[PDB]
Design a protein around this ligand. Structure first.
Ligand SMILES: C[S@@+](CC[C@H](N)C(=O)[O-])C[C@H]1O[C@@H](n2cnc3c(N)ncnc32)[C@H](O)[C@@H]1O
Ligand SMILES: [Cl-]
Ligand SMILES: [Cl-]
Lengths: 311, 625
């Protein structure tokens, strides 16, 4: 059976996979080819059932594609749309419907990245229009609009526990550390040479002044914001690092997405522990199960919702 | 009115989207031909063998719609000049794939960005696609007036914006375009899509785009100010630019989402239409010049050739020219014969090169106005024009006018003349060979006789026009020098161009010529102070003439006779464009040469760099004697 609103089919290009604290699975998908170029939002109470449409808890269709996604608490879904809109979708009282809370067209091009800030009341979006916008999820408005970069914004990442702090990176080769408290909020951090363009950012879940960043040449780098000169790095992928996600573990494992169609799991020294060639297309997202911390899920463009067992 | 287009980087349903933009008032749509986020792999497996379809079907629109309403957009991930080899190769294959899909669709134009300094591989791939077939498709290079790096918010504590003046650095996006189009060998298929930002740069940066092939202007919604009624409007400085662009007849493009939520997407276009309608109207000259703008024409040779009938007709419909000739004769008649002699003294008036008879009639209107007696002779070499003259003299003029079907240089006059009146002048004054014509005729002018016109002077000004340079470039013909087109003058309504320095006199001729050794050959050196960074493509020529005393004619823009459309500027091109830096002097050399058979010009640029001497020995161009 398909929920009362859910479409008969889910678009081939799976962009996002987000495990809720209870264990439910959030799916973002787009139609990146064919007659219609739209998107859809899916909820799977059984993660082993995905990507099967007729076996989901809830489902809805957005007007355009889903470039990025994030959980906004337990019933909130924040969407980075191709329309240039940032969308907030509220999950039903029964959690059987996904209803549009707000659709605001503030960006002048595709919104490619979204990150919810520590409070869960504010969020930051990064667009192709080169701007970065700070949002009020309750008031449905943009508090601040920042044009700090020179090229498109690839990734925006809120700090785990600070509402004022967030990371951003762009095709202008800049990794910006933000702090809404300073009059000049951004600070251009980065190592000696410019090198290859930054593509992905992952804040450390325990060390609040540490983060990792993946480039366009498949390199993964470990960075201490204080020492401000990239000490540790490894050539993990043969193509652009699409995403970086840390495990919920006390000493977290680092999962690494790529366009080389592979997944990799790394330790503190960025050494390879696991590798999966499960995907036949681009690896788009990764979520560790809040229920089983050794379980890691992945979504790709090959419409595969793979489940991995991490040693 | 305005030809407008909507720019979108998101099209979920092509049929719906097009209908909405058409309902909004847009004449065309700029949209992706593949999905913007759909990165493709062409080398590495498994991503290489990705199942199709690679994009939406051509069946979704009619051929007519594809040909006239859709402007394709290159995918933003396609980066042919990336520092990463794999990305360079994938972006190459993807660029070829995308451009070929647009040609397969018969798209009227396709958009490609110039958003960084190095676009060498982007250019190579486009140039290679241009030479793969023979199509009429246009490539619009999306360039901003101001690079995004140079307009970024000053919010990076440890990387502040440079608050100092950087003249050449502020012009950087022009250099991006210049390099890209030089690499692509000035393809007529490569044009500019100029992206206008919220804050306009210094005028020199804007003026840097004068003479460039701007086919489209991109106006983001962000740049629109909001009026007291809540409607989107523009700053007076932005309005200034729009008005400059409307004369270039560019296609306006609206990009970005609607920030004026209370109103619809038709309001942005409504303001452009409002500005378009309110601009000053086209004057007598501007209305005539319409259609002749940057159209290269051959200069007329009324001496060597016999002008067509509809050609004299065109010349005759210039009112200011003949009003001025009338006045100059009127003034001469009173100065030559006093009121006490107004019935005993009859003036021998000779129209040398009478055409169909406008100067003959003007001479008559002038002798009636001055209340003096005149004896007219109408000398004309064109026998076809002489048919009109003889039918006029029999039907109207009478015995008063003696039509002479001859060349003034050969005609043996029965008596000398008091006044010789002629209109043997071209856009460069002496380019129709008036010095030689009147030199062989002045023997039958009284020792104290007046020549109307008494004097004429040619002027030159250095110009920049990559548009007109490419136009001259396209004038290659078979069975001649492959570069002969650059060694000849053109008559043209110079429109999309930049005058780099104030006109300066070149050649002057006075009639009658008192010199015992009459030499119409010349050599002139001019030094033109240039205060902009630019590229020289040639020299505009104009002229000034003294008919009699204060009665004059001019095509020099400074002193242009109001409403006179008989002459358009001449253009002397140069084979290779020359880079001129701000503060440099352009030194040009001009010669007027001749033998017994023909007259021609030769020219060379000697500063800031040398050119070859153009038209040596009149090998590419001569004016027949
Ligand atoms: C009609 S005016 C041309 C003025 C015109 N508006 C222009 O743009 O130059 C030139 C006339 O003088 C005549 N003409 C030129 N050379 C001549 C010559 N040597 N003897 C007699 N008539 C001559 C031509 O045949 C022509 O009719
Ligand atoms: Cl651009
Ligand atoms: Cl301009």
């Amino acid at each position: 059976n398909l929920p009362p609103n859910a479409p008969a089919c889910m678009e081939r290009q799976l962009e996002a996979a987000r495990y809720r604290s209870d264990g439910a699975l959030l799916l973002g998908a787009s139609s990146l080819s064919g007659r219609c170029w739209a998107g859809s939002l899916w909820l799977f109470k059984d993660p082993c059932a995905a990507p099967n449409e007729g076996f989901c808890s809830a489902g809805v269709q957005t007007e355009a594609g889903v470039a990025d996604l994030t959980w906004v608490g337990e019933r909130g879904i924040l969407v980075a749309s191709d329309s240039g809109a940032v969308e907030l979708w509220e999950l039903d009282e029964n959690e059987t419907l996904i209803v549009s809370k707000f659709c605001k067209y503030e960006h002048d091009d595709i919104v490619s990245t979204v990150s919810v800030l520590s409070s869960g009341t504010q969020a930051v979006s990064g667009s192709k229009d080169i701007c970065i916008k700070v949002w009020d999820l309750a008031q449905q408005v943009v508090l601040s609009s920042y044009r700090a970069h020179a090229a498109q914004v690839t990734c925006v990442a809120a700090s785990p526990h600070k509402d004022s702090v967030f990371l951003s990176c762009s095709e202008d080769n800049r990794i910006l550390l933000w702090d809404t408290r300073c009059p000049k909020p951004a600070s251009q951090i980065g190592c000696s040479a410019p090198g290859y363009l930054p593509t992905s950012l992952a804040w450390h879940p325990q060390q609040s002044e540490v983060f990792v960043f993946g480039d366009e040449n498949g390199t993964v780098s470990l960075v201490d914001t204080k020492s401000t000169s990239c000490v540790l790095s490894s050539a993990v992928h043969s193509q652009c690092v699409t995403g970086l996600v840390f495990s919920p573990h006390s000493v977290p494992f680092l999962a690494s997405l790529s366009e080389d169609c592979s997944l990799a799991v790394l330790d503190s020294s960025l050494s390879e522990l696991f590798r999966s060639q499960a995907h036949r297309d681009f690896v788009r997202d990764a979520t560790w199960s809040p229920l089983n911390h050794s379980l890691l899920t992945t979504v790709g463009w090959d419409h595969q919702v793979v489940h991995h067992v991490v040693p | 009115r305005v030809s407008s287009g909507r720019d979108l980087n998101c099209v979920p349903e092509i049929a719906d989207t097009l209908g909405a933009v058409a309902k909004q008032g847009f004449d065309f749509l700029c949209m992706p031909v593949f999905h913007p986020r759909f990165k493709r792999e062409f080398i590495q497996e498994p991503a290489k063998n990705r199942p199709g379809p690679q994009t939406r079907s051509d069946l979704l629109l009619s051929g007519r719609d594809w040909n006239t309403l859709i402007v394709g957009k290159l995918s933003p991930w396609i980066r042919p000049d990336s520092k990463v080899e794999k990305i360079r190769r994938n972006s190459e294959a993807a660029m070829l794939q995308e451009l070929n899909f647009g040609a397969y669709l018969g798209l009227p134009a396709f958009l490609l960005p110039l958003n960084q300094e190095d676009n060498t591989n982007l250019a190579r791939v486009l140039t290679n696609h241009i030479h793969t077939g023979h199509h009429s498709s246009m490539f619009w290079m999306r360039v901003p007036l101001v690079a995004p790096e140079d307009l970024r918010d000053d919010i990076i504590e440890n990387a502040p914006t440079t608050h100092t003046e950087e003249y050449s650095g502020e012009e950087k996006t022009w250099m991006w375009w210049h390099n890209f189009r030089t690499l692509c060998d000035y393809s007529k298929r490569i044009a500019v899509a100029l992206e206008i930002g919220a804050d306009l740069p210094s005028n020199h940066v804007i003026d840097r785009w004068l003479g460039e092939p701007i086919k489209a202007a991109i106006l983001p919604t962000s740049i629109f100010l909001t009026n007291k009624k809540g409607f989107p409007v523009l700053s007076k400085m932005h309005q200034r630019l729009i008005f400059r662009l409307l004369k270039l007849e560019v296609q306006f493009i609206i990009t970005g989402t609607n920030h004026h939520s209370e109103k619809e997407f038709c309001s942005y276009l409504q303001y452009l239409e409002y500005l378009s309608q309110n601009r000053p109207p086209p004057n007598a000259y501007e209305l005539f010049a319409k259609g002749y703008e940057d159209y290269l024409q051959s200069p007329l040779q009324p001496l060597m050739d016999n002008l067509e009938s509809q050609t004299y007709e065109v010349f005759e419909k210039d009112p200011i020219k003949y009003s001025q000739y009338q006045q100059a004769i009127y003034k001469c008649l009173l100065d030559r014969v006093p009121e006490e002699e107004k019935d005993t003294n009859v003036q021998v008036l000779m129209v040398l090169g009478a055409g169909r008879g406008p100067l003959v009639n003007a001479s008559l209107r002038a002798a009636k106005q001055a209340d003096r007696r005149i004896k007219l002779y109408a000398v004309e070499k064109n026998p076809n024009a002489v048919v009109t003259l003889e039918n006029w003299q029999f039907e109207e003029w009478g015995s008063q006018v003696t039509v002479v079907s001859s060349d003034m240089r050969e005609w043996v006059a029965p008596e000398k003349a008091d006044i010789i009146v002629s209109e043997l002048l071209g856009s460069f004054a002496d380019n129709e060979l008036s010095p030689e014509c009147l030199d062989g005729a002045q023997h039958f002018l009284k020792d104290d006789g007046v020549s109307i016109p008494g004097e004429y002077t040619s002027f030159l000004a250095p110009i920049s026009s990559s548009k007109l340079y490419n136009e001259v470039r396209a004038c290659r013909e078979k069975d001649r020098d492959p570069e002969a087109q650059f060694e000849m003058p053109y008559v043209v309504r110079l429109h999309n161009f930049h005058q780099l320095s104030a006109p300066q006199p070149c050649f002057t001729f006075s009639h009658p010529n008192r010199d015992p050794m009459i030499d119409n050959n010349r050599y002139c050196t001019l030094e033109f102070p240039v205060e902009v960074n630019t590229v020289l493509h040639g020299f505009a020529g104009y002229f000034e003439t003294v008919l009699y005393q204060d009665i004059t004619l001019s095509i020099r823009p400074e002193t242009h006779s109001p409403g006179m459309f008989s002459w358009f500027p001449i253009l002397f091109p140069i084979k290779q464009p020359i880079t001129v830096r701000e503060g440099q002097t352009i030194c040009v050399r001009f010669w007027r040469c001749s033998n017994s058979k023909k007259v021609w010009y030769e020219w060379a640029v000697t500063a800031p760099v040398c050119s070859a001497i153009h038209n040596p020995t009149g090998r590419s161009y001569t004016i027949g004697l």
